[PDB]
Amino acid sequence: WKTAFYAVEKRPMFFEQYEGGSSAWCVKYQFGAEDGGFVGCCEHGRILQI
Amino acid sequence: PAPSANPAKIFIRRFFSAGVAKNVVSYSNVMAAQRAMEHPVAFRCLDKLGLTVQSVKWDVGKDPQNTQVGDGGMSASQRKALQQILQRPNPTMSGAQLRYSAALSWACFGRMAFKVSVMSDGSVNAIWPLGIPFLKQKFDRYGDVESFQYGDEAGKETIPSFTKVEKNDKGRPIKNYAFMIVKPSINGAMNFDVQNTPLQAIGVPVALYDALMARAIDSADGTPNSKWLVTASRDLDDGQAKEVKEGIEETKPGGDNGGEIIFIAGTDVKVQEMKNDLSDIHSKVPLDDQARTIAGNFGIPIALLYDESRKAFFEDTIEPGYLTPLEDGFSMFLCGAGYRVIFDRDSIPALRKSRADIAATYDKVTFITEEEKREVTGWPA
Amino acid sequence: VIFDRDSIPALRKSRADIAATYDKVTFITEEEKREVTGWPA
Amino acid sequence: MVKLNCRPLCQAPTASRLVSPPCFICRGVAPSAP
Amino acid sequence: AAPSRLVQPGCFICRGVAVS
Structure with a gap:
């Protein structure tokens, strides 16, 4: 797995008070994250079926 | 002693996420630092700054503010x-x-790791500097980094920080750690x-510099280097017009009738001399200004690229x-209080004359004891 | 909290000269000759 | 703006079977007959 | 890759006595 499939992370999970759309009586929070993944060389794995 | 509660918890909450081993330098900055080593002026200032700091000589000594x-x-x-290690680090490398x-x-990059x-x-065995582009670190829950990851897949040495590591009964560590000296x-x-790097504010003029030099190298080869655009008239009998060409041509240095006049009987030929200035190809005026900017941003007097400027x-x-941040970084966690790493000022060849006269004039004063006359110009005791 | 002015590398020359000329003054006690250029006591 | 909220007064059970890998057979025995 | 089979040896015992 260390070379058959890679995991991509760019920017971790984050929150922030969304200034704008938020008034003196109601808050609007906004969270986000940026990540992805792909296969490496797929001659390194194997699958069993029926 | 340590209360373990810093106000840096404002970021691990949501601005950051624990246990992720984030990289310390953005890849754009690494590429900018790599290509800045190939640029003529950027490399020149870089290797100058690296060379000067490399020249100073280390030693451990009693610190002046020894209240402990x-x-x-x-x-x-x-x-x-x-x-020993400050003078002889890890084998196949010197302190310089x-x-x-x-x-x-x-x-x-504004970073230092070791x-x-x-x-x-507490007896340090060797020192290794760490490749800062591909060094990743992971933070704790409260406010700080605990270990550094060095390598993607095979390299997985989660070297602990100096913060959390097996300490001796007095406080000195017993196993490996790293420094991660940072610029505020x-x-x-x-x-x-x-x-916090000068590379943050030099992207534009270097781009201007390479663009203008691209214009310079381009127009150097591509502009004809010939003169005397001679043109014939529209009745000139090719068979004798070629005689006109060889007549004009056979005047070159190392020619039979060179330097004599050209006589054309009838059918007035007209020559015009091309200017071919080519003396502003690199745009001298808006090129030295860019050089000065990428110089001043690194903090180097233009005069260097007189002795007053060197001392400055x-x-x-x-x-x-x-010199001060590197010394303070090592002094912070490499040895106990009362002792710290120092470098000799008199080892700098440019400051020798200044120290010399300062020492001479202080000698003339009298309402000052000998020990304070010493410490004001080095010379601890 | 105090920071020592003589730690400024550019200020060393003037402090050196200002101390030398003060040494030549005579109608002034030693203690005030000190405090006028640092050096508390 | 009403936002409803419902919680079944009564509940109920949930049964299921526990099929398990059978006493196996092997595909092809050497000493045999057509 | 196309799904390849995983044929294994069966119950192999004898080479010298055919069954009646």
Whole structure:
């Protein structure tokens, strides 16, 4: 797995008070994250079926 | 002592996420630092700054502000061994090369990292600098970094930080750790902040510089280097017009009738001499200005690229931008209180005359004891 | 909290000269000759 | 703006079977007959 | 890759006595 499939992370999970759309009586929070993944060389794995 | 509760918890909440081993330098900055080593002026200032800091000589010594009578020179043998490594680091490298690479990485990224191999009793065994582009670190829950990851898949040495590591009964560590010396910036975020590098504010003029030099190298080859655009008239009998060409042509240096006049009987030919200025190909005026900007941003007097400017460059940017932070970083966690790493000022060849006269004039004063006359110009005791 | 002015590398020359000329003054006690250029006591 | 909220007064059970890998057979025995 | 089979040896015992 260390070379058959890679995991991509760019920017971790984050929150922030969304200034704008938020008034003196109601808050609007906004969270986000940026990540992805792909296969490496797929001659390194194997699958069993029926 | 340590209360373990810093106000840096404002970022691990949501601005950051624990246990992720984030990289310390953005890849754009690494590429900018890599290509800045190929640029003529950017490399020149870089290797100058690296060279000067590399020249200073290290030593461990008693610190001046030694109010801690409970000296932290715990063994006086660890301090002896610490002197050994500062003069002879990890094999196949000297202390000079360590100073050069440390200052270079600090100038390029605003960061300094190292690795120690303390044997079992506070006696450091060797020092290794760490490649800053591909060094990743992971933070704790409260406010700080605990270990550094060095390598993607095979390299997985989660070398602990100096913060959490197996300490001796007095406080000295027993196993490896790293330093991660950082340069401060706005809005705090001691370790979560963005880097602070001159490379942050030199993107535009270097782009201007390479663009103009691209114009320069391009128009150098491509503009004809010929003169005397001669043109014939529209009744000239090719068979004798060629005689006109060979007549004009056979005047070159090392020609039979060269330097004599050209006589054309009838059918007036007209020559015009091309200017071919080619003396402003690189745009001299808007090129030195870009060179000055990428120089001033690194903190180097233009005159260097007279002795007054050299003394200024030594005691205004190099000293309080590379020498003081590196010295304070090592002094913070490499040895106990009361003792710290020092470098000799008199080892700088540009400051020798200044120190000399300062020493001479102080000698003339009388309402000052001898010991304070010493300490004001080095010379501890 | 105090920071020592003589730690400024550019200020060393003037402090050196200002101390030398003060040494030549005579109608002034030693203690005030000190405090005028640092050096508390 | 009403936002409803419902919680079945009564509940109910949930049964299921526990089929398990059978006493196996092997595909092809050497000493045999057509 | 196309799904390849995983044929294994069966119950192999004898080479010298055919069954009646």
